[PDB]
Amino acid sequence: KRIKTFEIYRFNPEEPGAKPKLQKFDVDLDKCGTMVLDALIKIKNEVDPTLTFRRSCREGICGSCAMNIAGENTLACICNIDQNTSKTTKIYPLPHMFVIKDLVPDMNLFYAQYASIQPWLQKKTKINLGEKQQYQSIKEQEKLDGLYECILCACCSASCPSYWWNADKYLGPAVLMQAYRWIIDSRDDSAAERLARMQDGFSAFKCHTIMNCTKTCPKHLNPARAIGEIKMLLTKMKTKPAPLPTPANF
Amino acid sequence: TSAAVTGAAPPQFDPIAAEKGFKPLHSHGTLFKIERYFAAAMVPLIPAAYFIHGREMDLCLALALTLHVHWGVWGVVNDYGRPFVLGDTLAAAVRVGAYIFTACLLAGLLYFNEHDVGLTRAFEMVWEL
Amino acid sequence: EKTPIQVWGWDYLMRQRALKRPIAPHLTIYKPQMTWMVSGLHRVTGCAMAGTLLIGGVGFSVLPLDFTTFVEFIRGLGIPWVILDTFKFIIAFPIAFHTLNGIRFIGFDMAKGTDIPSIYRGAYLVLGLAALISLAVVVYPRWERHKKATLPT
Amino acid sequence: SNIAQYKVIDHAYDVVIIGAGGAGLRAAMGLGEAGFKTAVVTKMFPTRSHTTAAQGGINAALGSMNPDDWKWHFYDTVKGSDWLGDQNAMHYLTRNAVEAVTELENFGMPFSRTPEGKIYQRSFGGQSNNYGKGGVAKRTCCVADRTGHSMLHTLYGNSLRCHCTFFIEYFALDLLMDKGRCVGVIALCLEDGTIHRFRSKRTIVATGGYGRAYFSCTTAHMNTGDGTALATRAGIALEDLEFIQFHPTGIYGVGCLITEGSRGEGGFLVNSEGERFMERYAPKAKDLASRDVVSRAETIEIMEGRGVGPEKDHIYLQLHHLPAEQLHQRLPGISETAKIFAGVDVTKEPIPVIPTVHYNMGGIPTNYKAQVIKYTKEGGDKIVPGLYACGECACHSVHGANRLGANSLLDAVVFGRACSINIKEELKPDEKIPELPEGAGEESIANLDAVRYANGDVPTAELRLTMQKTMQKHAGVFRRGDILAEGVKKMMDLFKELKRLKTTDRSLIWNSDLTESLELQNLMLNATQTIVAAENRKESRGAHARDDFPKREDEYDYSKPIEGQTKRPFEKHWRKHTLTKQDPRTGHITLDYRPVIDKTLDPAEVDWIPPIIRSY
């Protein structure tokens, strides 16, 4: 029988003055699904129901199962199990996050920071909601490709050592890409004010171009490229283009 | 039992309600620009300093390094000199130490260029060993 | 001054402090990669140099000893050329690598070459040239000093 | 409450919404625009909601690709329902589709584009131009392969503007009822273990489906039918629960969805003879036939030995004949989901797929205004004051016996919006927030404590497994009276084994053992009612297919000309919604039946659509 072992970070906040720990669990690979989430679920159901972690989608689209596996921040539901049984796989929560319990981090600063970018379409001329479609060209909307895909899982932010030390002031790669997703949207008028919110020395400029964000992103996105692009804009080295004019027969 | 007490809404960041009074323009963008231009400008200066030597390269190096290092340590201090881990006043002290650090650096290099072999010469003498 | 979110973020931290909650492991657990090790090196080299310039300039002033009589002291320790030329490499590399990697990081700052293939080639490319240059600068002159020890004329 | 101490916390709101998917968030936006102090209770961060897993698109007659008409969409919606759908609601759905999807765009949703600069539409299963006489329709608007992801994120983003106050990772336990009215919700805060009672003038149940009743599904682990369970405990009968959508293409081994949009872009099903077999089971529409007809087609091909792969138990979905530029542009998400889960380069090898449990056209019965209802055969539909429901957890019924593809996101946004429109107009600012009755939510805490400290010998994960396994075997794609009745037997015994429940995690702070048990209780209430309704129904309509009753039993024989026949009485025929009253304590289920609404909202605007033979 093929027995893989996992070293899972544990922490119980209800125990008197408890400390975090590492717990080893053995799993028969032949009575378990191919992905690391499968292992966690099996262990939870067949050994230890106190094992606590987030999951929802089984296909890597929700972002719930973000955690640190084998040293990298990834999604448990699409990371395959390393079948070399002589190795143990270490599973920690998202790095440098405050931990509620086990592999479940507190996520509300991440989310708060996501709100602060005003992630919604803005227009300087009030529009009748139901009435008509806004014009956007295939080229213009393709600038969103590589930006809207983001499932908002936090992997990249929790891989960023700048965001480790200064989460309170540096918005981090996840939010910064999303900010830029509303800046290069050609249907959006507030490009100017969006950049205005992250003018200061920490909001965006505390990105020290480390590149962990782009390496680790499990959706194969590139936030470093988007942060770089925001810097170019903040330094007036580039501008946002004007919307391609809306044709007469539209 | 349900003999409860009335509760408040959770911490939640209202992005609109935080938009009333937030005008201030403090654009760090222009500074971030010159920092990198200055770095790029130093690119040729380093091999220049390999070939040409003397008391004025010693002086150009002294200046540009001092300035570029001032901007550097400032950021390194701003990364690690965190009030969450140091409290507010020790953080301020470290920020101040970035300026003390720049000022001793220059004074130390000026001294060295003026009462000693100087930067380039001093490199020659270790590369003769 | 702070942006509103940065004020909210402080209060958030103070809340988390108050809830006696642990911080998830970071340096101790994160897989070393060419991305964050090289950044770490760029900083280490950058800082190490300044520190040497400070302990140098301020050092030789405050002390009675000067740099000429220092070089004499270590010269008179009669230590082998292989070891001396290593120390010279160790001195050239910080400067070489940092200067090279410096220009790579400005590229990143302009959204240039930020894909993982490029990130990884850049990292290797810069570690390479820096070692080549450091070695060039130590060895070539030492090779001239052998072309003088044993030579016609 | 007997054993432990629970910290109860009271809150007062104009409207509480249980849910944060399409329906939930669209409703919050409407209500917050309309001024109301709104509270959104969701057991997971809204972006993690299942809406985000949606792929294929959202229907609206925008006519970006060719001329279109919302009435043509209405036709297909009704025909899709196999005339179990309430036509007043299917009217409202389609009449509003253009507006709703346009709004979504205006909100910033990054729809894929036509060269003209308009919203790209694709073809999809079960839709046609011209009242079923013209060609294949192209109503299905999309952000490529991730329409649900992009819609939910856009909606969520826009909900940070309505000053709506989110309670995230709160597990809704029950509705707060006071003499047949819904004054609130009671829930549990995962973060800290505290119990929360929400007083509210209104209450919108927007909780999504119950796909995890079965053993294999495309749904999330969070699709446990909590809302329907909530309703059952409130003493509200559920509607049409036997109508379970099996989606034709879910990845063979693992259950992950491959969108119907992959067919509608040119892909097709192939059996082990290398034959495009859908040309037999449906000559006109071939691979784009309705969802229930295709899933039955595959299921037969398996049963008659034509199945594919080592065990000959699934079939192939072929896409590799399409250009690699189309696959990357139209289907990037599944192009990748196939690589990760099936190890398949979709541009060369086909995807191993097989019908998989997917949608729930059943749910909480409502009128066309999304107001929950009880039904007496004398007093008719009687609304439940204070209670609305929408999205998948609801049953309007816009889907009847078979949901049309890309009609769900549409359903959720339309009727989610509809709730706010209706509450704006019926709720007025003199009326004040209801005071809770005494000891409110006390039994909800009693159940919590009991399950938290449950001491039995059957542990929560085994029971769910045998529920899932049972439901899979008996209430399947093809069902029979003896199997059904044997299944009903097994399930009613599993409901008893619920008293022998073991849990282990005794904590209150983020206890995923405790909630997954609460979820199991809920899942049992949905599953039991699903199978008893499925057993009694002696006909074959939509996704419900009885081998021992293969014909759709209407008031007439709509295969023969209508005039010169006599109306069968309500009790003999089966064009009628199934209602399932369940006692949550005993588990006993009574049955009743409710007439299908055939009128439209306005005959002047559009005529109703008399039943015909359903042939794709």
Ligand SMILES: Cc1cc2nc3c(=O)[nH]c(=O)nc-3n(C[C@H](O)[C@H](O)[C@H](O)COP(=O)(O)OP(=O)(O)OC[C@H]3O[C@@H](n4cnc5c(N)ncnc54)[C@H](O)[C@@H]3O)c2cc1C
């Ligand atoms: C894989 C897949 C792909 C699909 N693709 C498409 C498509 O392309 N087009 C289309 O039209 N339809 C599609 N559907 C169908 C459609 O996406 C869903 O039916 C629809 O999104 C449901 O929306 P909803 O808001 O009703 O529920 P959901 O979107 O599932 O949201 C449910 C909400 O209820 C909350 N909730 C549940 N229980 C509790 C509780 N106890 N307490 C508090 N909150 C609770 C959850 O936290 C969540 O926020 C797809 C379905 C699946 C499974």
Ligand code: HEM
């Ligand atoms: C000659 C060309 C040089 C270039 C192009 C260059 C470039 C850079 C850049 C781009 C940074 C910012 C990195 C960040 O913020 O993440 C930086 C930081 C720094 N540089 Fe240089 N540099 C050069 C020479 C030097 C020299 C000679 C020293 C000598 C002491 C030095 C010391 C530093 C220090 C201390 C930092 C601190 C910030 C950090 O570690 O990230 N640099 N340099």
Ligand SMILES: O=C(NCc1ccc(Cl)cc1Cl)c1ccccc1C(F)(F)F
């Ligand atoms: O701290 C950094 N990297 C992580 C790290 C911390 C401590 C050590 Cl000893 C080593 C490394 Cl790599 C870092 C490095 C270069 C630039 C910026 C940072 C920082 F501050 F942003 F995180």
Ligand code: SF4
């Ligand atoms: S970018 Fe990649 S990693 Fe960062 S959040 Fe969006 S998805 Fe998760």
Ligand code: F3S
């Ligand atoms: S990991 Fe961090 S500093 Fe910048 S480019 Fe990547 S975000």
Ligand code: FES
């Ligand atoms: S559980 Fe959905 S991202 Fe893994």
